[PDB]
Structures are given as structure tokens and as C-alpha cells.
Amino acid sequence: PSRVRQNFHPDSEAAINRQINLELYASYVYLSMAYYFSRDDVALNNFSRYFLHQSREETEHAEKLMRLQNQRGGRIRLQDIKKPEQDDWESGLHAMECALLLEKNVNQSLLELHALASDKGDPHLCDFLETYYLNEQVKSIKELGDHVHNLVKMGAPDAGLAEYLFDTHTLG
């Protein structure tokens, strides 16, 4: 094994590789959303900027896991990054609802990774997830929930002013 490896189970190593792929996938979903909002027939520039920022954060999340793999003496194994489920995200509200579902799915994967790390007696990996992932996920889910609620109440997507006003006053 790696001269650095200590208390690092092969199952944890493999689960970290799966998590890297999921974070890169989330990054790709958000990149797709960002450029949907800059279409000439959508043109919600602050929705675009919001999702572009989320995309870049997800790439940061992937990289921190790649660094962890190296720090612990595991070996990064990359896989294809699957394309997002849609190119046409329909509306600001629909994109927000899809982002909320994505974040809950990523959160579930992180909770499963934490349960594995616990089962394998890996407190370093548990602390890593708690310190950098789990609260970030809760904050992200709460923010998306807030945004979905306001858009629904405002009458998105059919009320003509709703996404326009939310773009300029919440995301601006």
C-alpha cells in the first residue's frame, strides 16, 4: 500500500471515488442550467449567474475529495461525467426545483458515506464530511427551498412578472 495509508478502508476509498463523480455531475447540471438562463428566449441573467456560481462550487467539492483521496493514500479513479437529464430547464422555478432535488440526492450520498466511514472506524473521514460537506448541503438545500417558496408564491412560471422580479431583486 501507499507509505502514507493508515486506517483507510478500501470501501471508503471506492465510496470517495463515487462521490467525486457525483460532485462533478452536480457541477455539470448547474453549468447546463447557467447557460439555459442566458438563452435569448429566457434571458434571466441573475439566474444564470446564480447557477454558474453553484457549478463552480460543485467543482470545488469534487476537488476537495480528490485531495482527500491523495492525502489518505487512496487512488483517484475517474469515470464518465454523465450529461444532465435536460438541456431545456423550462423555467426559473423548474430549475430551482431540480436543483433542490439534486442537492437532496447529493446529501443522501454524503450521509451514506458518513455511515460507511463510521462503520469503518474512520473518524478523520467522518470529520472531513461534517466539516466541509454536511452543513454546506443543509445551507444549500435551505436556500433552494427559500427560493422555490418565493417563486411559487409569486406565481412563477406563468405569472409574467414573477421570474423577472425574482431575478432582479433576490438573485441580483
Of 118, 100, 102, the C-alpha closest to 23 is: 102
DSSP class of residue 82 equals P
In the complex, what is the shortest distance from the CB of residue 60 to Fe ion, in angstroms, rounded to a whole number? 8
Return the residues of window 118-137 that contact a second copy according to CB under 8 A: 118, 121, 123-124, 126-131, 134-135
Per partner kind, with CB cut-offs from 5 to 8 A, the member of Cl ion, Fe ion, Mg ion, none near residue 79 is Cl ion
Q: In the set 12, 48, 55, 91, which binds Mg ion (CB under 5 A)?
A: 48
Do the Cβ atoms of 38 and 45 come closer than 8 Å? yes
Residue 45 sits in the site that holds Mg ion (CB under 5 A):
yes
Nearest 5°: phi and psi at 26? Answer: -60, -40
DSSP class of residue 132 equals I
In the complex, what is the shortest distance from the CB of residue 108 to a second copy, in angstroms, rounded to a whole number? 7
Grid cell locating 61: 467539492
In the complex, what is the shortest distance from the CB of residue 19 to Fe ion, in angstroms, rounded to a whole number? 9
Known binding positions for Fe cation: 23, 58, 61, 103, 137
